[PDB]
Design a protein around this ligand. Structure first.
Ligand SMILES: *Cc1c(COP(=O)(O)O)cnc(C)c1O
Ligand SMILES: *Cc1c(COP(=O)(O)O)cnc(C)c1O
Ligand SMILES: [Cl-]
Ligand SMILES: [Cl-]
Ligand SMILES: [Cl-]
Ligand SMILES: [Cs+]
Ligand SMILES: [Cs+]
Lengths: 394, 258, 394, 258
């Protein structure tokens, strides 16, 4: 028994050990109650406006589209406090934990951005925060783990499995199953067991709500398409949500194509994986022919989640949203283009979305089209990566 | 239907005994060594077996079992190789009940129904799907019954009465009890609701706890990690590993005669 | 002859080679004309709103002041595009260059932030940008120089003199004196020859104008004091400007105290230097008993300017503003405090302002006081610095 | 008042000659070597001297002079040591006009008026303050006149007529002309406005340009960096440095007799 539907068509559900089901049911009932609480809605909006910087800008890129009939806008989630859209929903979830009378936060993180976002929300709201991180990711993201520790978070390395994100996700669930009375598991994407896909969307949907109001203000019409990268699906569903019922508005999600789909070294399970059951959900995933979960490769570490939110798999199967992929090289080229022609350093994650928008533009340059790209983060964390690849050639 | 759990619990109740069920990971630390390990467990007095299939992301298992999975993967153990072990085990031991601890994806991968058909063909008796709650169990338990497999469900210590009723109604073979809300309440309520016999599997590591679980009313005890610990400690000497395995199991099983 | 007063009391002026005077007079007349042009004001505000993220938030810090009668707000210039307040005035100056029909930008930079800000403004507005940087600073700020190059800027090392900021400032002036017909010198602080102190203030004064409107909204009254770090004076005069005529509002500027004023190793010329003539202005400066200009030491590289804006020296001498200093260790402690209790990583520059606010609070904890600290930048660029110092001890 | 520029330009006009004025940095590359350098410049035929004091931030000087300043700082040259050199130079050469190229801060440091008093005491004839425009020159030129020092002002190539009038009215000794807007216009307008005699100092590096500046109407030429280049090239051999210095200056000075 649940108050909300845990499935999006065939996708989603609550595939957790029985001991975790009370935790999920308590979380759903608090969330449903919080959603109807005008005082919760006002504190949430307050933190978003006065602590995080919302509403974010909608920037028109005139240099990048010159000579074509494409009009490109960027939803500037890179200007959010923390440098990425993740801050929206950790603020919501941390308020949810306080509503449930909890004083502790559990989180996992791969590239480090969700751990930094969980740590800053926990520091602001007076919550003790422990973060599980794969040891190989701990070694690779020494800046982000120092950020977490500076903000008072306890960072716990995870050496089991492959020692990456999915193995961190396992160790957080185990923690929560024994500690959910005092601790809230702050899941960092729009995936996992219900109600997390629904919760993360509703706490990210101001992205699309603002974009709609801003695009109507500046252009008098809805966009022809909104485009967002898809790692776990949170920033994309945040952009998509308020446009789902505007049928004339295309919804395009961009998975990492890695070295190329045909190489096997990619992170695009929605279109090139296979339906599976892992991390509390039924969703397409990166799995062997046996059923063992593999990792997702991308030059952009924040797209490393080996599965995808179940609402995206559902939106694909009914044809409401379309999903594509963009390779490392395509994303890098889009990274350099935005820097040189708009003075904006995008996260390599968001460079996948922009790279597809540039392809839509460049392939059909006389097509009249109004595009909004969700710029989910800034890319200062990526300049060292881009530097190495670019001098590896010349 | 061969009724192996039912026949065992009959034979055990007729002799005022409790069941002892060890857990091991199939292929840990190697296929041939695992087969010897399981043969010495059965010879030492195990009443039934719970066998795990190495899964890449066992989100419901502690560190001791996590390392067992990696030792089996380091040996190149696959689900197909496990079902080859299961057939060889059943062919050596026709009577012992063999249960599997599975993760949902290995069951769902090639089709739920085909997985339970393969269990019936190799002689498996029960399937616990670690990450499937009763709320999501409908396709799994229905496929298990269609193929004469008993679906095993965990009864957590927090279980309210509606969960108790579902566990009693949905389960077969035995009820996986994690307990010591009152322990004697859960065991009596499960009997009240005609549940499958309850086996205690919380922290069963000594003969004394096997004896305590039976007095509490449970039909036996499952040792979840103690057997896997003995393996991990004696990796350097497979000979002494089996002796310490035979010594421990005989201790736990004799603790169930009273 | 000038249209505006080049002096603030005794401080300021236009002490440049005669050949540069036409450049300054042309710049003053364009600026005066731009200021009266409503279309210039609307394009400037547009870029600030839709490209840079303005208005920035005003965050109330409740955790940091608990147990005292201080109410602390932070003006969040760290949420501005680029990560620092510098973006405001380079956008203004780049529009001024376009107004003058110029296609090229000259800039100098020390820590790299003004070079990155000049490069992003030049990329956005279609201007060719060359940046002079001291070779010792080029070696120390490899991230920021790669940012500049990614954004299409040409970075020219300066090996003359001490090879730091002041030697970069010299090499830009020489460039401009021969190239001012096509190039605009984009000076990066509220100092140098007139009209640059006046121009940089007017292009930074929205900081204080927003703070006034936001503090009146949330508290119904003006602040008891606004506090800002003083490297060259641009972020501080930006905060101060709209409060100068509210006499009941204290204005506190915080110079870097370095290892300590008594050590000589500091960067506080306004209070511990001596009036001099350099960089086109009469102002207090870091100089030897002979008159040779020395460098300013600070743990925070962005406070390295060896002099100070002439309006600050004037505001000090009439007693309108008060200026103090904060040591490296005091600033570091404030850096760690903001991270752990508010989840905000401040620039080590802005940590000087916050550190003084914390001192005002902690010294007199029963004093009722409403403080606004200008948080001029984010501090991700500083985590490696803070990491080294903190493990150098334990 | 000793009237050294006036007496020189008299002696030069009575013999249909133009002036040649070399620039060097005081103390470059060392105090003793600099003193020899200046003695061989005067002996080779220099009519007057322009001497720079090493300043830490010469924002109005090209790279050749920037390196000269660092060679003098590397020798530990201070403003006080320069004024000791100026006294020794004046004591050896009573007639030659000695001008200083200063930066405003070294003049302002201990008080403007006291700086020009020290110039008068050591025998300095003129002061060009490189970073003081005529618009800011009031306290400087007034102090210079009170102490019998001629304030020198640069006339840039772009100079409109109001700048020309100020330069003519405010300057003494000579006008520092950077030129070849029409060159003959500036020289005639400066004469029209009774300016001090104009010396050309743009790119004076060859005998041919010294000859061209005089024909254009200017009273002579200042070699801004050519002398400093010869020093920098012959650092390894101070002996050959002086010979190349004596050869060059005699070339430039003979170019001014016609
Ligand atoms: C985390 C990350 C992503 C991927 O996360 P989603 O859940 O797919 O939104 C995308 N962009 C940035 C900047 C990220 O940090
Ligand atoms: C540049 C810098 C400063 C110092 O510059 P001012 O002209 O004094 O404002 C202060 N804070 C930050 C973040 C800076 O980058
Ligand atoms: Cl266009
Ligand atoms: Cl904003
Ligand atoms: Cl308070
Ligand atoms: Cs993915
Ligand atoms: Cs300063």
């Amino acid at each position: 028994t649940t108050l909300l539907n845990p499935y999006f068509g065939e996708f989603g559900g609550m595939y957790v050990p029985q001991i975790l089901m009370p935790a999920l049911n308590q979380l759903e009932e608090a969330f449903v109650s919080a959603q109807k609480d005008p005082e919760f809605q006002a504190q949430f909006a307050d933190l978003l406006k006065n602590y995080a910087g919302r509403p974010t800008a909608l920037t028109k890129c005139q240099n990048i589209t010159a000579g074509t009939r494409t009009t490109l806008y960027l939803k500037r989630e890179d200007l959010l406090h923390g440098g990425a859209h993740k801050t929206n929903q950790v603020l919501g979830q941390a308020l949810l934990a306080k509503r449930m009378g909890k004083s502790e936060i559990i989180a996992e993180t791969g590239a480090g951005q969700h751990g930094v976002a969980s740590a800053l929300a926990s520091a602001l709201l007076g919550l003790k925060c422990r973060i599980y991180m794969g040891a190989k990711d701990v070694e690779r993201q020494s800046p982000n783990v120092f950020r977490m520790r500076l903000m008072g978070a306890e960072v716990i390395p995870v050496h089991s499995g492959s020692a990456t994100l999915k193995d961190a996700c396992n160790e957080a669930l185990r923690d929560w199953s024994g500690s959910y009375e005092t601790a809230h598991y702050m899941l960092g994407t729009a995936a996992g067991p219900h109600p997390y896909p629904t919760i993360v969307r509703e706490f990210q949907r101001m992205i699309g709500e603002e974009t709609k109001a801003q695009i109507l203000d500046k252009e008098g019409r809805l966009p022809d398409a909104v485009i967002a990268c898809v790692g776990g699906g949170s920033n994309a569903i945040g952009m998509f949500a308020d446009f789902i019922n505007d049928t004339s508005v295309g919804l395009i999600g961009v998975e990492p194509g890695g070295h190329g789909i045909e190489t096997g070294e990619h992170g695009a399970p929605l279109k090139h994986g296979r339906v599976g059951i892992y991390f509390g959900m039924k969703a397409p995933m990166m799995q062997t022919a046996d059923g063992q979960i593999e990792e997702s490769y991308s030059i952009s570490a924040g797209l490393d989640f080996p599965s995808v939110g179940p609402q995206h798999a559902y939106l694909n199967s009914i044809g409401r949203a379309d999903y594509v992929s963009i390779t490392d090289d395509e994303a890098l080229e889009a990274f350099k283009t935005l820097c040189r022609h708009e003075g904006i350093i995008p996260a390599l994650e968001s460079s996948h979305a922009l790279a597809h928008a540039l392809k839509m533009m460049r392939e059909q340059p006389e097509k009249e089209q109004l595009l909004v790209v969700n710029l989910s983060g800034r890319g200062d964390k990526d300049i060292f990566t881009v530097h190495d690849i670019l001098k590896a050639r010349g | 239907h061969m009724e192996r759990y039912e026949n065992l619990f009959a034979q055990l109740n007729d002799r005022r005994e409790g069941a002892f069920v060890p857990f091991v990971t199939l292929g840990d630390p190697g296929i041939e060594q695992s087969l010897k390990i399981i043969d010495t467990l059965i010879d030492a007095g195990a009443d039934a077996l719970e066998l795990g299939v190495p899964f890449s992301d066992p989100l419901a298992d502690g560190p001791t079992i996590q390392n067992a999975n990696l030792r089996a993967f380091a040996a190149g153990v696959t689900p197909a190789q496990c079902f080859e072990m299961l057939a060889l085990i059943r062919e050596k031991h026709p009577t012992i009940p063999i249960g599997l601890l599975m993760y949902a994806n290995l069951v769902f991968n090639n089709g739920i129904d085909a997985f339970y058909a393969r269990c019936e063909q190799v002689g498996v008796d029960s399937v616990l799907v670690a990450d499937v709650p009763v709320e999501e169990s409908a396709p799994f338990r229905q496929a298990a019954l269609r193929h004469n497999i008993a679906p095993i469900f965990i009864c957590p210590p927090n279980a309210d009465d509606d969960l108790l009723r579902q566990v009693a109604s949905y389960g077969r073979g035995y009820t996986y009890l994690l307990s010591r809300l009152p322990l004697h309440h859960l065991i009596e309520k499960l009997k009240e609701y005609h549940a499958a016999p309850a086996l205690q599997g919380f922290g069963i590591s000594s003969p004394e706890q096997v004896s305590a679980a039976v007095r509490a009313g449970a039909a036996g005890a499952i040792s979840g990690s103690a057997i896997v610990k003995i393996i991990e400690k004696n990796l350097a000497s497979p000979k002494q590993m089996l002796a310490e395995l035979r010594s421990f199991v005989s201790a736990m099983k004799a603790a169930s005669r009273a």
